[PDB]
Design an enzyme around this catalytic site. Structure first.
Site, PDB file in Angstrom:
ATOM      1  N   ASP A   1      42.140   8.714  52.452  1.00  0.00           N
ATOM      2  CA  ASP A   1      40.742   8.427  52.153  1.00  0.00           C
ATOM      3  C   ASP A   1      40.575   6.930  51.898  1.00  0.00           C
ATOM      4  O   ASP A   1      41.042   6.412  50.884  1.00  0.00           O
ATOM      5  CB  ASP A   1      40.275   9.234  50.936  1.00  0.00           C
ATOM      6  CG  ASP A   1      38.877   9.821  51.116  1.00  0.00           C
ATOM      7  OD1 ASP A   1      38.243   9.544  52.156  1.00  0.00           O
ATOM      8  OD2 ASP A   1      38.416  10.569  50.223  1.00  0.00           O
TER       9      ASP A   1
ATOM     10  N   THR B   1      34.669   6.890  55.298  1.00  0.00           N
ATOM     11  CA  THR B   1      34.959   5.898  54.271  1.00  0.00           C
ATOM     12  C   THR B   1      35.835   4.764  54.797  1.00  0.00           C
ATOM     13  O   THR B   1      35.674   3.614  54.395  1.00  0.00           O
ATOM     14  CB  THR B   1      35.644   6.542  53.055  1.00  0.00           C
ATOM     15  OG1 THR B   1      36.116   5.521  52.169  1.00  0.00           O
ATOM     16  CG2 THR B   1      36.815   7.386  53.501  1.00  0.00           C
ATOM     17  N   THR B   2      36.757   5.092  55.693  1.00  0.00           N
ATOM     18  CA  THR B   2      37.687   4.104  56.230  1.00  0.00           C
ATOM     19  C   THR B   2      37.012   3.200  57.253  1.00  0.00           C
ATOM     20  O   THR B   2      37.205   1.984  57.249  1.00  0.00           O
ATOM     21  CB  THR B   2      38.900   4.771  56.909  1.00  0.00           C
ATOM     22  OG1 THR B   2      38.484   5.397  58.129  1.00  0.00           O
ATOM     23  CG2 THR B   2      39.525   5.810  55.996  1.00  0.00           C
TER      24      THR B   2
ATOM     25  N   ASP C   1      36.479  15.249  51.789  1.00  0.00           N
ATOM     26  CA  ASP C   1      35.948  14.545  52.948  1.00  0.00           C
ATOM     27  C   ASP C   1      35.416  15.543  53.971  1.00  0.00           C
ATOM     28  O   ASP C   1      34.714  15.169  54.909  1.00  0.00           O
ATOM     29  CB  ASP C   1      37.023  13.656  53.589  1.00  0.00           C
ATOM     30  CG  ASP C   1      37.100  12.268  52.962  1.00  0.00           C
ATOM     31  OD1 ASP C   1      36.785  12.118  51.762  1.00  0.00           O
ATOM     32  OD2 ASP C   1      37.485  11.321  53.681  1.00  0.00           O
TER      33      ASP C   1
END
Ligand SMILES: Nc1ncnc2c1ncn2[C@@H]1O[C@@H](COP(=O)(O)OP(=O)(O)O)[C@@H](O)[C@H]1O
Ligand SMILES: Nc1ncnc2c1ncn2[C@@H]1O[C@@H](COP(=O)(O)OP(=O)(O)O)[C@H](O)[C@H]1O
Ligand SMILES: Nc1ncnc2c1ncn2[C@@H]1O[C@@H](COP(=O)(O)OP(=O)(O)O)[C@H](O)[C@H]1O
Ligand SMILES: Nc1ncnc2c1ncn2[C@@H]1O[C@H](COP(=O)(O)OP(=O)(O)O)[C@H](O)[C@@H]1O
Ligand code: BEF
Ligand code: BEF
Ligand code: BEF
Ligand code: BEF
Lengths: 78, 52, 544, 514, 67, 513, 140
Positions: D55, D88-89, D381
């Site tokens: 994450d 998120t990445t 996620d």
């Protein structure tokens, strides 16, 4: 550098060396208690860090009242 | 311009009355014109830059 | 971990980290002097960590004073001092091209391009780049008029830029007028140049050129004439070291029975003076040795009113004797048996006057048999400037020499570096595929210079460069002339202007030797992926 | 003399470039994890952190960056997990790549940030449109629309090999609450059990918890039981305020004793009059409290974790009642189909199976204490990408596709709008390829050939065509089960760029002391 | 990739000219593409690596002391 | 620069692989010498307690090692994991890993994250076939007991206590029998005392509480009808608490008599309950056992919590709450209660015929005070295997059969895929193939020629087989009775290629101090 | 690779037999590996790097061998047997199908350096280098 771990302050007496450290101490506790058997035997005076004196021939006495760091030894002491 | 508090907090502003709010000055003279902007932001909202 | 070898002090970086550390190390030494170049560029001051300063705009000398920590950086410093050897000017710029070549090259392998492909993408773009120089430099063979332009373009982006036009000629004239030699059937101007001094104090503009050499020396004895002019003067460059004489070593002196220790004491001095006179008897208007004259051998050169200079610069008495037709004598003996001297050894000048320049005085030598003598004596406020003024000189004299030793010249001012930019990418991209992206960056890396010539001006210059593009791209493409190309940057006033119409002009050689070496440096680092760095030899520090 | 000695200042191009190229750091590290050929990282903070979560937030939290223009990325990420679960990445990638492609102009210039800033400020909101054009709810509408939107998410995580299970796992729990047409994303409960495996993760259709005990003679299991959510201590907890019992007379003590006994004796009986099978309270009853209820055949409960018991009433429909003497008969929960105590690992969980109940508690098992957690964060996620897949049935054709499509749009507009605004327009345009770039570099298949051939095609059509390394080459991610919820791709760009300008809005940086 | 395809071309054409050419970015013939090295080159290499391994493999214990 | 502040180290790629792959095998070579009776035990000394542990249990062998490496500490989790879920084999659950990833390492010369795809799909084919070869049944308690013993035996072997293997295998299968399927292994407590010799470790159908009867009372009991009281035999007082002030001087004249009487109600309440013996959670005042001894009621002051219930669930007599509120209807139907005479302190006893079952598998072994521990944890490793068969009737043969069937099956698939992912498969098999190989190292048979030998037999027979450690013939494990439960050998397989995945995906790392 | 000397000098080169020597090594056996690389140079003059990557694979698989109850010494000469077969197979592959030309033909001698010249810093400038070397040798 390696680390190689394992961990620092730790040591692996392995295999034959383990075979040594193992055997090589068991009979260590021999020369200590050898005197006790036989009416012709003799006793031992034990001192300590508290400034005291013990002079008796019993083995639990000369094995419990001893300082030892080789497992086997302590084990037989046990 | 970004500013990092003496406590480590991070602060970014355009307002000059805040730039100094987060700024630890030493110059007794500069202290004045800083007291100015600050002594205005409270009484009147905007105009803090035209001060300095 | 590891085990690998060997620590400590011995380490190694791998692939990415190195290819980066290398690029950073290059932009470092690069980005420092990235302000210097261009008329809009300035000078800097380096501190001898003991207070002492040194103001200079030269890129080469500036990088030397940096210290060059690391292999990649020092590699550029090494590439710099190469440029002076090729040329003499552009050291400030060559470093940039190189640095930009790596910067971009790596930015490609960072895109998983692989170096081999890139190292060729330059290998080719370079050859074709020179193939475009064949169209630019050639037209600059015919265009004393355009020599003062090149000597002037070597002034801008420099301290003497303000007095450019003035010193522009002082530069040209000494080399053009009085500085020509010939070795083995070859005509060239002094790549070792012509003596230049510095006069503490005095006016900027009033730097006195000289119709002769300027040997920096003082009269041996005060009793000697301070000047001997008129015409046809007797010059003598004697490296005989005619001071005194002591026994030949290994030849001890044991006396007996006499009572003769005195019979040869003076004899030791006699043989000296005997040679001194033998030379004074052929002319002896002015005597110039390298070893030096002695007090007991000056009185003799003094009474005859012969100017004598104790221990001169050997590199001078050569250049001097070469112009006065004299012959820098080594040993007295000429064949056997000979004393000796011949009036055929002496020189031919007009005036040998010892001038003055603010709490200092140097002997000049005006006029010669062969009319090849020039010495520019600068003069300014402080040593701090008078020295740097010389840097602009040593760096401008060169630009001319290289020029006058190669008929081909080139429209500088970002012009050439602009044409290539458009020409290769538009016209080099025949191979395409991946190799294209390489060539591309090689061309783009060239804009780096024109860019900084502009960024040097605080004002937004992003556009002034954009124009230089469209303009130059106009020479061919896209979608009987008159050729609308060949223009260039006018840093002084914003907007494009034909450079040939202007004094600006750089020797083709400079635009080559610098474009070429900038590549090899780049390549050599591209091939790098691992830097093993083993520690030196530590102090014994033995616990026992 | 001011300024105070000493606090660092970078005036000039310094902070202007040593903040973008400094933010690039953290943006250069994470730029490897994304997509099918993922690169999960491990890190040991102070003490034995020993945490390995892919994450991007979870990662950028451990770097604990101290640099201002960097803590911006550890922030531009932190937000993601608030709006959209996954992605998120990928934010940081662009967030930085933008900053990155801003360097060329900014350096050969002679160009103030304000120019670049608004220059992107347009391109951004420009791209936001193209996205809002592509999502289409819902052509082949089915309850599988969410399911395959999660296989796009779980994909390339530490669960992908066993994912088709953790897929239906996520969806199920999500669809247990009334968020359809509003309901929190907390009620599903994620429990951590020591030993086990990913595949051996149980999807309790009810509740889950363990508690302290004092006597095990209680019934271990009961079918369709009656569950009281008490919330009281019954041993003999002293009165709140200073409670004291001063006495007079010889034979009164015992009266007080038998009275105290009586007071609690009653309360206990009160529970019986409710006819429950398992008393679940949030506080402590030990000793006789258990004893009696156990004789009656009811497994007493130690106070049950706060957020625990708050799941139980909803699943069982019961309502927690801190009062015992007014306990109504319509406050108990029987929804439990089968409540047992099947021991797992070194622990023992009390599971309330069965449903009409909101909190779909998941007891996730693992093989390593550092992995059980990497799976948890590997569903946070997911469950969220599900939640958003419901809230907005609008789906973006992800897989580097929506990016390659937006690019062509922005690139299209920029040419007509030539000038010092063309470059910055062709910026976010080019930099939009940041994703499809290392998205492939991570895998291995040539990227340059792939995008030079992906652009060359996507440009002449193939509006929703991404890079699907399943078969090599690239194709319309619209056909395959490649679906990314709308909010992700959209909100991310607006965010990644929000900082991609803030760090340009920077003149200099002034520090402090300790 | 190339290894597997080399195994085939090897068994089919007795590995006579086949190999890996960086330039060709594939598996063409070494001889065909003028890729040549002395017979000693790769033969005097093996003889070494082997006689070397022998040496290393003969090692059972390492102790230290001033020679 | 920042970052968060060095000194922090960072390892990425090539080396980060080796240092992890080689980093794990580091653990594996030491770990392996613990397979089959021709197996070794290692000593483990703890800094603090300065006492050492000797036994062979992969879980403990590693749980007792301070190890710096993340990749190693990782394995140490796998062990401590299977031990929890399964119970046995933990010693090897890593072995196939270190080998597995050492395989993956060589294979890595070739993307890693794809290798995980193979090991999870190919070792899934293995996981499958191993279910096929499994042998279920029977479900007749007549046959069960004979299988459970064979399991307990195969597990109890190679452990110091193997000497009287049967003696223990019996201990296990019994305690497992009581409490159907499937019940927690928390009610049957393994108590141990240091008593001369080995094999004096019997299983007990009651409890062996530490406490010894108070005063000079009888040491035995006939037709035991014990009593489970809670409250201490002392004059009561509210928990809220209250103070009693003797306002009246004459009030004490009656207060004194209130003392002796307010506890005499304990005696009356005891005889009336028909109870014969007693014991209380809380302690009893010296003013009580006195009354107890004369009556002949037996005193057992203070008992642990979990012991209060053991004594209870033994006779099912309900845990009484306060004296005099206890119904004679609730009593302990204990067969007998005695005081065994160990050296020094002697524990009391609560024997039961059923019983009940709350087994206490007390183990002595005076020979070595630190062997009891070494042993009573092996009895466990037995217990938890004799249970898995109850919960999971499935069983499979060991001696290398497990791996043999897989590597055999897996083997074919690898030659079929003719894919790079496919080579992955082949290693997944060669990793398994490694387990038996290693099992040969210890027995003494040459490995190389022993697996090939063993793999042919699977073909002739399939899949029954294995490699004999000691008895001749290289006989099939079903004949020699060398088998362990099937689900266990599943978790092992999966759980390994799991850490093999996560650990093979890391690539790069960041470590601080 | 770049090599910073314990003295200070910098080295960038492709000669792995010089690269290995430059990079300080500890392990006495790793040291061995160096000499066997410096041998191929004194013997042939090329493959200074390739021979090392061989000494690896071998030792790296003799690893796999010992790990399976295969005796070291049995592997030593066991390998040496494959050595003499390899140094012999090299002819059965150039007898034969390819080439063994020694003189009167520069088309090959040059191409020997062209490959040899190729794959070094001088890759680009080899043409002049390749022929030059060949010519500067064949004439002695
Ligand atoms: N077109 C504009 N609209 C609004 N403000 C402008 C405009 N052009 C310039 N400005 C400047 O923006 C404001 C000043 O900036 P500001 O940071 O707010 O100073 P202050 O808050 O102390 O008044 C205006 O008063 C003006 O000087
Ligand atoms: N007047 C000019 N306008 C624009 N560019 C110029 C001009 N004069 C020279 N240049 C180019 O940029 C210059 C940069 O200065 P440089 O020669 O590198 O340092 P320095 O002149 O101090 O030795 C080049 O010499 C030249 O090709
Ligand atoms: N009698 C046997 N003959 C052949 N192999 C055996 C025999 N007994 C056990 N094995 C194999 O080797 C064992 C190793 O012991 P293990 O249960 O893994 O840890 P530990 O021995 O320390 O309890 C396996 O469980 C098993 O398949
Ligand atoms: N008079 C005797 N002659 C021969 N042997 C004797 C005699 N008296 C005793 N022994 C034996 O010699 C042995 C050694 O004594 P031992 O048991 O070892 O004392 P301890 O065990 O307390 O050290 C026998 O156990 C026994 O006592
Ligand atoms: F915003 Be203003 F400067 F006060
Ligand atoms: F470029 Be100049 F010579 F500094
Ligand atoms: F696996 Be054994 F029981 F240690
Ligand atoms: F080693 Be190669 F020949 F440069």
């Amino acid at each position: 550098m390696s680390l190689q771990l394992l961990n620092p302050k730790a040591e692996s007496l392995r295999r034959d060396a383990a075979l040594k450290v193992n055997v090589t101490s068991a009979e260590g506790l021999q020369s200590v208690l050898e005197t006790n058997l036989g009416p012709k035997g003799t006793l031992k005076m034990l001192v300590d860090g508290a400034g005291n004196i013990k002079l008796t021939k019993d083995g639990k006495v000369l094995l419990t009242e001893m300082q030892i760091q080789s497992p086997t030894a302590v084990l037989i002491a046990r | 311009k970004i500013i990092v508090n003496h406590l480590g907090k991070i602060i970014i502003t355009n307002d000059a009355a805040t730039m100094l709010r987060e700024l630890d000055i030493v110059h007794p003279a500069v202290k004045v014109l800083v007291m100015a902007t600050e002594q205005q932001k409270i009484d009147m909202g905007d105009g803090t830059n035209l001060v300095m | 971990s590891r085990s690998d070898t060997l620590f400590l002090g011995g380490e190694k970086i791998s692939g990415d980290d190195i290819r980066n550390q290398n690029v950073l190390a290059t932009m470092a030494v690069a980005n420092v002097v990235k302000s210097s170049l261009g008329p809009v560029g300035l000078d800097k001051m380096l501190v001898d960590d003991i207070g002492d300063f040194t103001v200079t705009n030269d890129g080469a000398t500036i990088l030397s004073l940096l210290d060059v920590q690391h292999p990649a950086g020092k590699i550029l410093v090494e590439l710099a001092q190469q440029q002076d050897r090729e040329i003499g000017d552009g050291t400030t710029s060559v470093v940039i091209i190189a640095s930009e070549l790596l910067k971009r090259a790596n930015e490609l392998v960072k895109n998983k391009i692989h170096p081999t492909t890139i190292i060729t993408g330059f290998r080719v773009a370079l050859r074709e780049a020179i193939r475009f120089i064949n169209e630019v430099l050639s037209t600059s063979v015919d265009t004393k008029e355009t020599l003062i332009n090149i000597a002037k373009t070597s002034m801008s982006s420099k301290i003497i830029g303000a007095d450019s036009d003035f010193f522009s000629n002082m530069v040209v004239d000494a080399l053009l007028a009085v500085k020509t030699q010939n070795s083995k059937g070859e005509i060239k101007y002094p790549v070792k140049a012509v003596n230049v001094l510095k006069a503490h104090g005095k006016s900027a503009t009033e730097s006195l050129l000289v119709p002769g050499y300027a040997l920096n020396c003082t009269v041996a004895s005060q009793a000697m004439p301070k000047r001997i002019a008129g015409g046809n003067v007797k010059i003598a460059c004697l490296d005989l070291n005619l001071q005194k004489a002591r026994m030949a070593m290994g030849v001890q002196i044991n006396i007996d029975d006499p009572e003769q220790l005195e019979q040869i004491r003076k004899r030791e001095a006699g043989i000296v003076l005997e040679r001194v006179k033998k030379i004074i008897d052929a002319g002896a208007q002015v005597v110039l040795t390298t070893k030096g004259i002695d007090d007991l051998c000056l009185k003799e050169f003094v009474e005859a009113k012969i100017m004598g200079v104790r221990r001169c610069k050997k590199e001078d008495l050569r250049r001097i004797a070469r112009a006065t037709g004299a012959t820098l004598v080594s040993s007295m003996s000429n064949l056997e048996g000979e004393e000796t001297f011949e009036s055929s050894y002496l020189g031919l000048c007009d005036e040998v006057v010892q001038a003055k320049f603010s709490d200092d005085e140097c002997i000049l030598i005006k006029g010669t048999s062969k009319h090849s003598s020039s010495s520019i004596i600068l003069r300014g406020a402080n040593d701090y400037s008078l020295d740097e003024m010389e840097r602009s000189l040593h760096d401008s004299l060169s630009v001319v020499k290289r020029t006058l030793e190669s008929g081909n010249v080139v429209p500088g001012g970002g012009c050439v570096e602009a044409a290539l930019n458009i020409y290769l990418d538009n016209f080099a991209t025949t191979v395409g595929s991946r190799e294209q992206l390489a060539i591309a960056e090689f061309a783009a890396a060239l804009l780096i210079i024109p860019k900084t010539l502009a960024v040097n001006a605080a004002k937004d210059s992003s556009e002034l460069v954009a124009k230089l593009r469209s303009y130059h791209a106009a020479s061919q493409m896209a979608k009987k002339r008159r050729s609308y190309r060949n223009y260039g940057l006018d840093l002084i006033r914003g907007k494009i202007v034909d450079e040939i119409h202007a004094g600006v002009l750089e020797p083709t050689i400079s635009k080559v030797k610098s474009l070429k070496s900038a590549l090899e440096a780049c390549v050599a680092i591209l091939r790098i992926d691992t830097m093993i760095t083993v520690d030196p030899e530590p102090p014994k520090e033995d616990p026992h | 003399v001011f300024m105070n000695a000493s606090q660092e200042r970078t005036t000039g191009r310094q902070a202007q470039i040593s903040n973008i190229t400094a933010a690039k750091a953290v943006a250069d590290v994470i730029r490897t994890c994304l997509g099918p050929k993922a690169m999960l990282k491990m890190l040991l903070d102070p003490m034995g952190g020993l945490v390995l979560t892919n994450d991007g937030h979870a990662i950028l939290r451990e770097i604990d960056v101290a640099h201002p223009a960097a803590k911006s990325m550890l922030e531009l990420s932190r937000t993601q997990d608030e709006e959209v679960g996954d992605g998120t990445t990928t934010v940081i990638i662009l967030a930085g790549e933008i900053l990155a492609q801003c360097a060329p102009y900014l350096i050969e210039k002679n160009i103030h940030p304000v120019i670049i800033i608004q220059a992107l400020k347009k391109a951004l909101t420009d791209a936001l449109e193209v996205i809002k054009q592509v999502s289409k709810p819902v052509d082949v509408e089915n309850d599988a629309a969410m399911k395959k939107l999660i296989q796009a998410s779980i994909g390339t995580k530490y669960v992908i090999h066993w994912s088709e299970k953790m897929c239906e796992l996520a969806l199920d729990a999500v669809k247990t609450v009334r968020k359809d047409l509003i309901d929190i994303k907390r009620y599903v409960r994620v429990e951590k059990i020591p030993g086990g495996d990913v595949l051996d993760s149980r999807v309790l259709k009810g509740v889950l918890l363990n508690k302290d005990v004092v006597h095990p003679k209680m019934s271990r299991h009961i079918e369709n039981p009656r569950v009281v959510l008490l919330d009281c201590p019954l041993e003999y907890k002293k009165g709140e305020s200073q409670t004291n019992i001063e006495i007079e007379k010889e034979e009164d003590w015992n009266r007080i004793l038998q009275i105290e006994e009586e007071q609690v004796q009653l309360m206990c009986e009160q529970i019986l009059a409710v006819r429950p099978t398992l008393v679940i309270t949030e506080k402590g009853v030990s000793d006789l409290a258990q004893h009696y209820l156990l004789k009656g055949g009811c497994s007493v409960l130690r106070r049950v974790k706060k957020s625990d018991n708050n799941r139980i009433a909803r699943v069982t429909g019961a309502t927690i009642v801190n009062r015992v003497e007014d306990l109504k008969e319509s406050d108990v929960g029987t929804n439990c189909g089968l409540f047992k105590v099947e021991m797992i690992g070194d622990e023992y969980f009390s599971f309330l199976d069965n449903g009409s109940g909101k909190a779909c508690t998941i007891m996730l098992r693992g093989g390593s204490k550092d992995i059980l957690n990497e799976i948890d964060r590997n569903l946070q996620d997911a469950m969220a990408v599900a939640r958003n897949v419901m809230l907005s049935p609008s789906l973006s054709p992800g897989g580097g596709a929506t990016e390659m499509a937006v690019s062509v749009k922005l690139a299209e507009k920029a040419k007509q709008l030539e000038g010092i605004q063309q470059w910055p327009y062709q910026a976010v345009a080019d930099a939009m390829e940041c994703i499809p770039r290392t998205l492939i570099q991570n895998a291995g298949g040539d990227p340059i050939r792939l995008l030079s051939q992906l652009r060359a095609k996507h440009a002449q059509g193939n509006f929703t065509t991404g890079i699907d390394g399943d078969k090599g080459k690239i194709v319309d991610m619209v056909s395959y089960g490649i679906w990314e919820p709308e909010v992700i791709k959209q909100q991310s760009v607006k965010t990644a760029i929000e900082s991609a300008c803030l760090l340009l809005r920077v003149d200099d940086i002034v520090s402090g002391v300790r | 990739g190339t290894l597997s395809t080399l195994k085939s071309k090897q068994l089919k054409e007795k590995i006579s000219n086949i190999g890996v050419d960086c330039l060709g970015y594939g598996s063409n013939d070494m001889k065909e593409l003028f890729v040549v090295d002395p017979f000693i080159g790769k033969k005097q290499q093996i003889l070494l690596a082997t006689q070397l391994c022998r040496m290393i493999l003969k090692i059972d214990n390492v102790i230290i002391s001033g020679k | 620069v920042q970052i968060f502040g060095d000194q922090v180290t960072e390892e990425r790629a090539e080396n980060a692989r080796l240092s992890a792959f080689v980093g794990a095998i580091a653990v594996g070579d030491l770990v392996k010498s613990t397979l089959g009776p021709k197996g070794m035990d290692k000593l483990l000394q703890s800094a603090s307690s300065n006492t050492c542990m000797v036994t062979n249990d992969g879980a403990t062998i590693l749980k007792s090692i301070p190890l710096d490496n993340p990749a190693a500490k990782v394995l140490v989790n796998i062990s401590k994991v299977q031990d929890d879920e399964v119970g046995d084999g933990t010693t090897s659950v890593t072995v196939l890993s270190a080998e597995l990833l050492r395989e993956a390492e060589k294979l890595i010369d070739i993307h890693p994250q794809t290798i995980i795809e193979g090991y999870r799909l190919a070792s899934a084919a293995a996981l499958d076939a191993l279910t096929k070869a499994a042998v279920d049944n029977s479900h007749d308690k007549t046959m069960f007991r004979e299988d459970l013993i064979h399991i307990a035996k195969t597990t109890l072997s190679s452990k110091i206590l193997s000497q009287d293997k049967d003696h223990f295998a019996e201990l296990a299968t019994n305690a497992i029998l009581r409490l159907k399927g499937s019940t927690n292994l928390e009610h049957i407590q393994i108590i141990k005392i240091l008593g001369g010799k080995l094999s004096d470790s019997f299983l007990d159908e009651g409890f062996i509480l530490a406490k010894k009867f108070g005063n000079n009372q009888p040491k035995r009991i006939e037709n035991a009808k014990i009593l489970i009281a809670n409250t201490t035999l002392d004059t009561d007082k509210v928990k809220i608490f209250g103070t009693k002030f003797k306002v009246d001087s004459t009030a004490k004249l009656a207060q004194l008599e209130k003392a002796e009487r307010e506890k005499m109600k304990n005696k009356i309440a005891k005889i009336s309950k028909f109870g014969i013996n007693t014991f209380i959670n809380r302690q009893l005042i010296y003013d009580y056992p006195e009354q107890l001894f004369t009556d002949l009621g037996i005193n057992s002051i203070e008992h642990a919590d979990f012991e209060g219930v053991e004594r209870l669930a033994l006779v099912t007599g309900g845990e009484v709450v306060s004296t005099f509120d206890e119904p004679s209807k609730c009593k302990l139907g204990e067969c007998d209660v005695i005081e065994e005479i160990m050296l020094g302190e002697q524990p009391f006893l609560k024997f039961s015929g059923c019983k009940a079952g709350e087994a206490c598998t007390i183990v002595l072994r005076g020979a070595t005070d630190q062997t009891l521990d070494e042993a009573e944890r092996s009895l466990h490793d037995a217990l938890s295997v004799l249970s898995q068969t109850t919960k999971e009737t499935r069983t499979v043969l060991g001696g290398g059969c497990a791996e043999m069937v897989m590597s055999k099956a897996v083997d074919t698939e690898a030659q079929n895929i003719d894919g790079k992912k496919s080579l992955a498969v082949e290693a997944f098999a060669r990793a398994l193939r490694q387990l038996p190989t290693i099992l040969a190292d210890n027995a003494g048979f040459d490995s190389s020629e022993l697996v090939s030998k063993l793999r042919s037999s699977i073909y002739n027979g399939i899949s029954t087989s294995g490699l004999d450690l000691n008895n001749g013939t290289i006989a099939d494990m079903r004949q020699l009775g060398i088998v362990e439960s099937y689900k266990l050998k599943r978790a092992v397989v999966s759980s390994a290629s799991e850490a093999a995945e996560v650990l093979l995906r890391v690539d790069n790392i960041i470590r601080a101090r | 690779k770049i090599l910073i000397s314990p003295d200070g000098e910098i080295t960038i080169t492709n000669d792995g037999a010089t690269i290995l020597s430059q990079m300080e090594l500890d392990n006495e056996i790793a040291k061995l590996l160096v000499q066997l690389s410096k041998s191929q140079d004194d013997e042939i003059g090329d493959g200074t790097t390739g021979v090392v990557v061989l000494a690896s694979a071998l030792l790296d698989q003799a690893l796999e061998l010992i790990q399976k109850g295969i005796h070291p010494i049995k592997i030593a000469n066991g390998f040496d047997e494959a050595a003499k077969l390899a140094i012999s197979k090299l002819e059965e592959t150039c007898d034969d199908i390819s080439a063994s030309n020694d003189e009167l033909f520069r088309d090959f001698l040059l191409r020997a350096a062209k490959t040899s010249l190729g794959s070094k810093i001088v890759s680009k400038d080899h043409d002049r280098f390749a022929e030059m070397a060949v010519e500067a040798v064949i004439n002695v």
